[PDB]
Design a protein around this ligand. Sequence first.
Ligand SMILES: *CC(=O)N1CCN(Cc2cccc3ccccc23)CC1
Ligand SMILES: *CC(=O)N1CCN(Cc2cccc3ccccc23)CC1
Lengths: 306, 306
Amino acid sequence: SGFRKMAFPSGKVEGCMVQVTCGTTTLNGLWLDDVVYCPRHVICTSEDMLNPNYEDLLIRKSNHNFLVQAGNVQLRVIGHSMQNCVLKLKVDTANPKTPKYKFVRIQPGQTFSVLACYNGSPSGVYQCAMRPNFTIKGSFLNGSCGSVGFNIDYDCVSFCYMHHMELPTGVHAGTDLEGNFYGPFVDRQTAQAAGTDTTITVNVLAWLYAAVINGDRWFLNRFTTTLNDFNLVAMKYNYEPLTQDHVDILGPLSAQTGIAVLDMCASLKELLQNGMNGRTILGSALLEDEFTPFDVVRQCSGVTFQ
Amino acid sequence: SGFRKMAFPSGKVEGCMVQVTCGTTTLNGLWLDDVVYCPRHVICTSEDMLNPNYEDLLIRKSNHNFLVQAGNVQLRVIGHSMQNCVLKLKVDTANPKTPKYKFVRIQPGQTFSVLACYNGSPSGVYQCAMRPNFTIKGSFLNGSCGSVGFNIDYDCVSFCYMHHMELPTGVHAGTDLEGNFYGPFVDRQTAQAAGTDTTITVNVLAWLYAAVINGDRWFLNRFTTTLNDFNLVAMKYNYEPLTQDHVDILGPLSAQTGIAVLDMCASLKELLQNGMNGRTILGSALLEDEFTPFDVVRQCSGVTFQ
Ligand SMILES: *CC(=O)N1CCN(Cc2cccc3ccccc23)CC1
Ligand SMILES: *CC(=O)N1CCN(Cc2cccc3ccccc23)CC1
């Protein structure tokens, strides 16, 4: 028993992190096979960031201008190209520690682990959700860019995020591993506004099911409700609307606890209107939305990986 | 910027986890050099747990009764001994992935990372604190015993915890790597009561300093206070008393924020008496005590490891 915000084990990713230096800037890169991936703003100076023309700046760089280091081993760049907002550096040595991997573009509300790195070296690991406004609320300092987010399925590492920037508001924005930003952001030093950050309703329900599995049952009430009636209340509190796909995804948790989704929705409705009255659920005084239904099943059943 | 409950990277520990089987029971073991460490209750049946005589049960076991597996590689046990509540299985092959390591017995209030494992395979990683009553509030299912807690300093893994049991109350108890339980618990299926679980005051202060570093300053008030006056209020709310050693440890955070410890204590005092009024600090509606002052400095300065 117990419930924790659990990250994936990071060992398979630790062996892929390298340090990338171009001119004076030093960021993290991700070394898979014989290619290193890193944010293209590694080629910028502090002055270029206000309005960078990446194509023009990249012309002034040659293969020998990029210094890639893996601990103390040194890689020779024999080819470079820009793909959207990431640089692909072809090196001479394939990474012997390359795991079974895949590049995936996640959807808002999905969760992943971040391996925060500085100078190519791992600093720590934590779990987070992609917010509905395509930001993440991470922990990143200068030099952490190029750190990656990932999931592990079976023996395969699915890379889904590379960190690029901190917004003036303190939240974080980045790309998939093909270099397409999540959200409308651009890699330029200019005022950018994220949208409204709504609560991931299907995740909150999954976490309420986790609470019941672990013995916190006080919020379970007599009422029930309808999907339309619930969504009308949810949207007033900036909760994402619930759809039938969401109800389908919660089916196995319903089956294990004997509590129907709409009944659970009626408990949530009352929690939104009346608050929590100074009580807690799974050790929290706020409704938590960084666990997907799959995260709950995974943790409550003990799924392991390679 | 940002602040997250961050675990250490787990790769160095993942390569040390093995599966240990004796008779019908299968737990996790920790393979360092040519020794495997595991909970001694691996030699018990479900019936033995009510009142086990470990010395007598261990007599009925020989070296070939223990099956240790590392993925698909198999270790041959050539010597076994009991040290307090852990078994030390001498094997024929030294672990090639043995890191620089150390065994350490931590003090209540210190934090560490747990690598939750099942059948010798990693499932996830999370950070937790040793509570003042020597329990931890983990996430553990059947088969997770022998999972270990650890810290990383420089290039050295400091093992400080091995999981042994779940109390009837849902909290977790275990030993150091010499097999001495933390707290008064015994590895036997009997009703055991943990003491009162108090809040780790010095950690709460460190986290308030983290909040100020990250821009949450609303709780900062006009008043100040004295150590004696603060402790008188803290003990009413089951907070650990603050000592001068605690004030000394917080010195660097005081220097970086320009806020004196006693001034920060006066803010906490008002938070304890008046509550939080539906506001949050670093995304939480509760005062958080699972960050040590060192965790805050580490995260807010970007310390890396091997
Ligand atoms: C994450 C990291 O290591 N850095 C982030 C900031 N900086 C370059 C950079 C990249 C994208 C946008 C942006 C906007 C303003 C200032 C700097 C920016 C390098 C280090
Ligand atoms: C953690 C784990 O894998 N297990 C814990 C429970 N069990 C054996 C065991 C060990 C210590 C105390 C105790 C008390 C009651 C029941 C079982 C107990 C094996 C699996």
